[PDB]
Design an enzyme around this catalytic site. Structure first.
Site, PDB file in Angstrom:
ATOM      1  CG  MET A 287      14.243 -52.084 -80.863  1.00  0.00           C
ATOM      2  SD  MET A 287      12.774 -51.773 -80.265  1.00  0.00           S
ATOM      3  CE  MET A 287      11.777 -53.196 -80.716  1.00  0.00           C
TER       4      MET A 287
ATOM      5  CB  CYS B 114      19.841 -55.670 -86.045  1.00  0.00           C
TER       6      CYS B 114
HETATM    7  N1  LIG Z   1      16.775 -55.997 -83.663  1.00  0.00           N
HETATM    8  C1  LIG Z   1      17.996 -57.158 -83.474  1.00  0.00           C
HETATM    9  N2  LIG Z   1      19.233 -56.740 -82.871  1.00  0.00           N
HETATM   10  C2  LIG Z   1      20.182 -57.617 -82.680  1.00  0.00           C
HETATM   11  C3  LIG Z   1      19.922 -58.976 -82.902  1.00  0.00           C
HETATM   12  N3  LIG Z   1      21.099 -59.615 -82.555  1.00  0.00           N
HETATM   13  C4  LIG Z   1      22.043 -58.637 -82.050  1.00  0.00           C
HETATM   14  N4  LIG Z   1      21.242 -57.606 -81.982  1.00  0.00           N
HETATM   15  C5  LIG Z   1      21.919 -56.176 -81.412  1.00  0.00           C
HETATM   16  O1  LIG Z   1      23.001 -55.946 -82.185  1.00  0.00           O
HETATM   17  C6  LIG Z   1      24.071 -55.437 -81.571  1.00  0.00           C
HETATM   18  C7  LIG Z   1      25.314 -55.673 -82.213  1.00  0.00           C
HETATM   19  O2  LIG Z   1      25.198 -54.943 -83.289  1.00  0.00           O
HETATM   20  P1  LIG Z   1      26.567 -54.278 -84.117  1.00  0.00           P
HETATM   21  O3  LIG Z   1      27.383 -53.827 -83.032  1.00  0.00           O
HETATM   22  O4  LIG Z   1      27.147 -55.316 -84.870  1.00  0.00           O
HETATM   23  O5  LIG Z   1      26.096 -53.168 -85.115  1.00  0.00           O
HETATM   24  C8  LIG Z   1      24.008 -56.564 -80.236  1.00  0.00           C
HETATM   25  O6  LIG Z   1      24.672 -56.191 -79.185  1.00  0.00           O
HETATM   26  C9  LIG Z   1      22.605 -56.647 -80.068  1.00  0.00           C
HETATM   27  O7  LIG Z   1      22.121 -55.341 -78.989  1.00  0.00           O
HETATM   28  C10 LIG Z   1      18.755 -59.497 -83.681  1.00  0.00           C
HETATM   29  O8  LIG Z   1      18.598 -60.614 -83.931  1.00  0.00           O
HETATM   30  N5  LIG Z   1      17.690 -58.620 -83.828  1.00  0.00           N
END
Ligand SMILES: Nc1nc2c(ncn2[C@@H]2O[C@H](COP(=O)(O)O)[C@@H](O)[C@H]2O)c(=O)[nH]1
Ligand SMILES: Nc1ncnc2c1ncn2[C@@H]1O[C@H](COP(=O)(O)OP(=O)(O)OP(=O)(O)O)[C@@H](O)[C@H]1O
Ligand SMILES: Nc1nc2c(ncn2[C@@H]2O[C@H](COP(=O)(O)OP(=O)(O)O)[C@@H](O)[C@H]2O)c(=O)[nH]1
Ligand SMILES: Nc1nc2c(ncn2[C@@H]2O[C@H](COP(=O)(O)OP(=O)(O)O)[C@@H](O)[C@H]2O)c(=O)[nH]1
Ligand SMILES: Nc1nc2c(ncn2[C@@H]2O[C@H](COP(=O)(O)OP(=O)(O)O)[C@@H](O)[C@H]2O)c(=O)[nH]1
Ligand SMILES: Nc1nc2c(ncn2[C@@H]2O[C@H](COP(=O)(O)OP(=O)(O)O)[C@@H](O)[C@H]2O)c(=O)[nH]1
Ligand SMILES: Nc1nc2c(ncn2[C@@H]2O[C@H](COP(=O)(O)O)[C@@H](O)[C@H]2O)c(=O)[nH]1
Lengths: 488, 88, 58, 56, 56, 58
Positions: C38, C44
């Site tokens: 989260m 995010c």
């Molecule tokens: N709090 C938040 N988390 C997101 C959002 N979109 C995607 N995520 C989370 O971020 C993950 C990807 O993050 P990354 O792997 O780029 O660090 C996704 O699989 C999902 O769990 C958003 O709009 N808000």
């Protein structure tokens, strides 16, 4: 072999305490000295929509707002324009005192008169005035609805009414008001209550409803647009008796500001904030005692304080609210210059843990730049949050734009502060609803239906927290990206 | 371009719009001085409140023959400027 | 609950969760897997905007 | 119900120690190794002007 | 004179009438302190501003 | 901006307050002459404007 999913909730019992930290465990000073960015609130269970969240918040012992938003008393943030709209949108604005006493009372006056039920002492005109005179008064006062009285005084005999449409396309500016004014005016007899006078106003589909006594003398007036302002702003912070927007103002604690307060009081002030970098002083204590017995109906917010001992002193003096913060503010250097201050999160918790026991609401002042800080400030015990740099640069904040930026300033110019600049942000008519809606969603994620329920669930250990390592603060925001471009 | 087109076009009473490269009052004067009858403004007026779109890095608005619109142009961003009721 | 009895051969991953209590709830509902995280994601801001989240390792 | 404001100072007694840290609690090395920017001094009570302060 | 005046105001904020009284109030546990997290040091100074321009 | 509004937006007598409020949002203005057939060239029966529906609760 694994455990049965049926026992998942039953198995939660086998753990000593709930996952995460209680607020006590988060704020002990010996294990210490943390701020908003050093912790998160853990999510709970959602079983209600975000529109269902109530954000009613106590500003003082007697005053409650529909939103915990308070604009800071700084000459780059809160004058009349800011105070009016903060009030309409569920909060309140504290007008700055970097100006003469007459200037500050006028600002308060313009806030108290923006919306009325019964307009007391409405601006009138005599029959001798001209169209040229009625146009000048529109430019000065912002409205053009003027009852016409025989002597030109608010309490004279009602002879007629003149409005925008009576002078709009008049070519001769030398005409007398008496020639073009509407003489057969629909009125309401004095003594009529508000709900009854509102109905007469509605039925005529006319703009105004002057109120007269038996002699035919004017006493007050109603405006059709105040009924509109109410419909457009159902959460506005206003007195239930007079229907005027609540207004706040800041003063110093020296002798000259005793007369200053009186003039503000006269102008309709509902709450005064005692503006001081370190509030636990003999000078401010005397001021609090003096205000409680000289203007007993006026609510007094003392500050700033950051310790339990400071809060006890100013509460014992009779404070109706406390302003928390010393040096945590954007463009504030008291901590570098005076070596004296406190991390804001720790100040809020330890003041409010004491102040709330006495029912003294506390403003979390300084260090707030986004919705998450508001949530955390309240989670730690604050009842409202004060915003300065956040609202500087909005259209309602006073100033002119110009490396869009607005100059932001308690420095040598206004040294325990600096002069700076903030970016344009648009109107708070969109920005405040955004923070409001944002706080609703965050209360949903946490599992609380109201800020009042939020406060109870924290003190009971239901709501949980987590310490923030410098590395997790990078995760919580944007990271590992080439570029990134909230609202609109 | 403005001078040599307008030196010929004005002889036929055909007004000409000086189009492109205008960013301030000085360009407008010079455009007219060389023969133009009016001046067209693109980037100058993008980022005003009356211009279409929404605001959003580092108050900007996306700008623009660009591949996105359809390459003889690019996609960019311009700064907020307020309302043309004051700017014009 | 509705997916387990309407499409029983379909595997259900619930989320996101970051606490033991959240996991217990969604497991008790019949989850076949849990998605953890989260606000720890790249681009995010839930933690800045909602003040709510958790360091990912924890 | 809330507490009476009259008891605010009397209630300060119910707390173990004063809000904040003593200097000893701030400088133990085992809990350590800090500089000027790692701490603040908390404010007290003002009952005198700043011109009255002696810096001998 | 600026540093001198500045130290006077800071002694007032703390509640001590002299540096000699300052030393006694610290050793007795009267004066209190708070540990500084790297995040609170940013609050104590200027933060969240596009630019910023003490004395004179 | 007009001098003579050619073919002004009209409303029929069967329309409701809810309908006149929808039209104000679509077209941006609430000044509607009322014609017997709802067509712009019908017989004029009346006019309805912002103040005629502003505080109507039904
Ligand atoms: N709090 C938040 N988390 C997101 C959002 N979109 C995607 N995520 C989370 O971020 C993950 C990807 O993050 P990354 O792997 O780029 O660090 C996704 O699989 C999902 O769990 C958003 O709009 N808000
Ligand atoms: N209470 C009243 N009794 C009688 N005549 C009135 C009353 N209020 C206004 N009038 C007359 O009706 C016309 C104005 O009505 P109103 O004052 O309701 O319009 P406005 O004030 O002009 O607002 P707008 O700008 O929307 O017209 C004027 O000719 C004025 O003389
Ligand atoms: N004339 C006038 N009447 C008002 C105003 N505000 C509220 N009222 C009246 O007070 C009554 C209840 O208003 P309501 O929206 O329920 O609550 P309120 O906005 O807090 O007063 C209504 O009959 C309103 O017409 C106002 O600003 N001016
Ligand atoms: N006409 C008038 N309005 C006042 C006065 N004092 C405060 N107001 C408020 O200013 C607003 C005027 O709005 P509006 O009536 O539409 O302006 P007008 O049509 O030119 O009178 C109302 O909300 C009033 O409550 C006053 O003395 N005269
Ligand atoms: N109904 C209406 N009349 C207009 C309008 N514009 C101008 N008029 C009228 O045309 C006449 C001349 O107006 P003028 O001041 O010379 O400006 P111009 O007509 O726009 O060039 C006046 O009687 C105006 O009232 C309009 O937009 N609507
Ligand atoms: N009322 C109305 N106005 C129109 C129409 N078409 C164009 N307009 C223009 O829209 C504006 C409406 O004026 P406004 O004062 O807003 O009228 P209202 O809001 O309907 O009371 C005027 O300049 C009109 O000339 C129409 O079909 N009906
Ligand atoms: N130490 C100090 N604090 C100030 C000064 N001016 C304003 N403040 C505080 O900073 C708050 C605003 O900070 P911000 O919300 O921008 O972070 C104000 O409400 C007030 O409490 C100053 O000159 N010195």
């Amino acid at each position: 072999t694994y455990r049965d999913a049926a026992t998942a909730l039953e198995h939660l019992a086998t753990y000593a305490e709930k996952d995460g930290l209680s607020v006590e465990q988060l704020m002990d000073s010996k294990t210490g000295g943390l701020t908003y960015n050093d912790f998160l609130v853990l999510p709970g269970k959602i079983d209600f929509p975000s529109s269902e969240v109530v954000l009613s918040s106590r500003l003082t012992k007697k005053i409650t707002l529909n939103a915990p938003f308070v604009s800071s008393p700084m000459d780059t943030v809160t004058e009349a324009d800011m105070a009016i709209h903060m009030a309409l949108l569920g909060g309140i604005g504290i007008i700055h005192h970097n100006c003469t006493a007459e200037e500050q009372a006028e600002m308060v006056r313009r806030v108290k008169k923006y919306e009325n039920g019964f307009i007391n002492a409405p601006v009138v005109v005599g029959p001798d005035a001209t169209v040229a005179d009625v146009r000048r008064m529109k430019n000065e006062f912002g409205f053009a609805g003027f009852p016409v009285t025989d002597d030109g005084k608010p309490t004279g005999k009602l002879q007629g009414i003149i409005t925008s449409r009576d002078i709009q396309f008049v070519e001769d500016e030398t005409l007398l008001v008496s020639e073009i004014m509407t003489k057969d005016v629909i009125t309401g007899k004095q003594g009529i209550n508000l709900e009854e006078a509102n109905q007469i106003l509605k039925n005529t589909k006319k703009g105004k409803l002057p109120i007269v006594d038996e002699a035919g003398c004017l006493v007050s007036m109603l405006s059709r647009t105040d009924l509109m302002k109410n419909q457009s702003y159902p959460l506005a912070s206003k007195s239930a008796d007079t229907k005027q927007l609540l207004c706040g103002a800041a003063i110093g604690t020296i002798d000259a500001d005793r007369q200053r307060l009186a003039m503000l009081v006269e102008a309709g002030l509902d709450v005064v904030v005692l503006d001081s970098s370190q509030g636990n002083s003999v000078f401010q204590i005397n001021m609090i005692k003096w205000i409680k017995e000289t203007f007993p109906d006026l609510q007094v917010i003392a500050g700033n304080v950051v310790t339990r001992e400071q809060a006890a002193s100013l509460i014992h003096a009779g404070a109706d609210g406390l302003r928390i913060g010393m040096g945590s503010g954007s463009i504030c250097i008291t901590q570098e210059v005076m070596a004296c201050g406190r991390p804001q999160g720790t100040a809020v918790y330890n003041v409010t843990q004491f102040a709330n026991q006495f029912g003294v609401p506390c403003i979390a002042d300084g260090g707030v730049q986004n919705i998450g800080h508001i949530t955390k400030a309240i989670a730690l015990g604050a009842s409202t949050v004060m915003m300065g740099g956040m609202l500087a640069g909005t259209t309602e904040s006073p100033g002119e734009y110009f490396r869009r930026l607005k100059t932001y300033r308690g420095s040598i110019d206004a040294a325990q502060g600096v002069t700076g600049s903030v970016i344009d942000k648009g109107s708070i008519k969109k920005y405040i609803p955004y923070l409001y809606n944002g706080l609703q969603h965050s209360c949903q994620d946490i599992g609380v239906r109201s800020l009042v329920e939020f406060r109870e669930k924290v003190d009971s250990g239901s709501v949980r927290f987590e310490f923030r390592t410098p590395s997790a603060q990078l995760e919580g925001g944007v990271h590992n990206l080439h570029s990134y471009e909230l609202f609109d | 371009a403005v001078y040599n087109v307008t030196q010929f076009a004005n002889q036929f009473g055909v007004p000409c719009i000086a189009d492109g490269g205008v960013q301030n009052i000085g360009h407008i004067t010079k455009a007219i001085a060389l023969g133009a009858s009016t001046v067209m403004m693109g980037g100058m007026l993008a980022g005003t409140t009356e211009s279409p779109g929404e605001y959003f890095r580092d108050r900007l608005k996306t700008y623009r023959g660009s591949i996105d619109a359809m390459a003889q142009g690019v996609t960019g961003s311009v700064i907020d400027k307020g309302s043309i009721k004051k700017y014009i």
